[PDB]
């Protein structure tokens, strides 16, 4: 948690990036940000370029509720500090209205991003080569490594929860079900609580255990999604019923559990690396260190 707020007035208003019930999210320049470095705020500055920030800022007539879930937000993101995790840059709490700055990611998440792209084919719009796609996957599996030595769960690692920066730059968010795009990825069960079943493990979805372990086999299905560029949604073939269905075939374990398909282009032994991460007992699925490694090497050998 930091010592001090971050000065207010040095927030530069440029654009609303998004709105919300009780609150906006504002695109922001930084007047003189160099000052602020010297005070352990973790800005990076250039030289000729400007300093962008995203802010946060609660609306001042939210509810009792939405100042609580704000304060929570606050809490979890002072913690996390990692190059491919979203970053606490400053906050303003100690009068109202409450304020979290962030990154700002100008190329959106990540299913937006590969969605407006084409793979490569060196052999013949924007398009994007098989290095950068496992470069992208080896960002998400350094982030995750690091979740993991906290012991933190993410529970909702999915491509729409990435954001892409400059230089095809990749940090882990969560975003929950707060955007209105993703609606058909989320199972509603208890009230207003839904569920990602599509990436969740069968343990997740039968128990509702969730672990490292469950956050590896999320991870499977998020490399499905980067190789097959983000066209089609997880079985997407299947009903939502279908998808639970499959996890008590998981738990049954007489073999007629199903699995994603290999993605087109895709090398058999990176398919086998995703069928390792559905492995039915939690102890066979390999850890982001192992995961890590294996797609940072490829993407140079490739
Ligand atoms: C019931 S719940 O607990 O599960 N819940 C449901 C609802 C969501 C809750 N999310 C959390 O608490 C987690 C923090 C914890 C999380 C833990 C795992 C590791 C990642 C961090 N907040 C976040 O990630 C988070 C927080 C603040 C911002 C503001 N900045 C932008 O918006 C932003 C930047 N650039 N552009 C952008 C720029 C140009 C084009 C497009 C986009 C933005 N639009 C963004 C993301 C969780």
Known sequence: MPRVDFPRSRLRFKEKLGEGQFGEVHL????????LVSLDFPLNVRKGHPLLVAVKILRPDATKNARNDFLKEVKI?????????????????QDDPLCMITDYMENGDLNQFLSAHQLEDKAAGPTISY??????????????????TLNFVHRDLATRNCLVGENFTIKIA????????YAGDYYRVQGRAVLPIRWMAWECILMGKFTTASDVWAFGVTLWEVLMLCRAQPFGQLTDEQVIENAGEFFRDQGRQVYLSRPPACPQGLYELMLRCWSRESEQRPPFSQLHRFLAEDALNT
């Open 28 to 35: 922001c320049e930084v007047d003189s940000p160099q000052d």
């Open 77 to 93: 993101m002072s913690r996390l500090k990692d190059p491919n995790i979203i970053r606490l840059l400053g906050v303003c709490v």
């Open 131 to 148: 290095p950068m796609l496992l470069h992208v996957a080896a960002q998400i599996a350094s982030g995750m490594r690091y979740l993991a």
């Open 174 to 181: 969560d975003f929950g079900m707060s955007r209105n795009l």
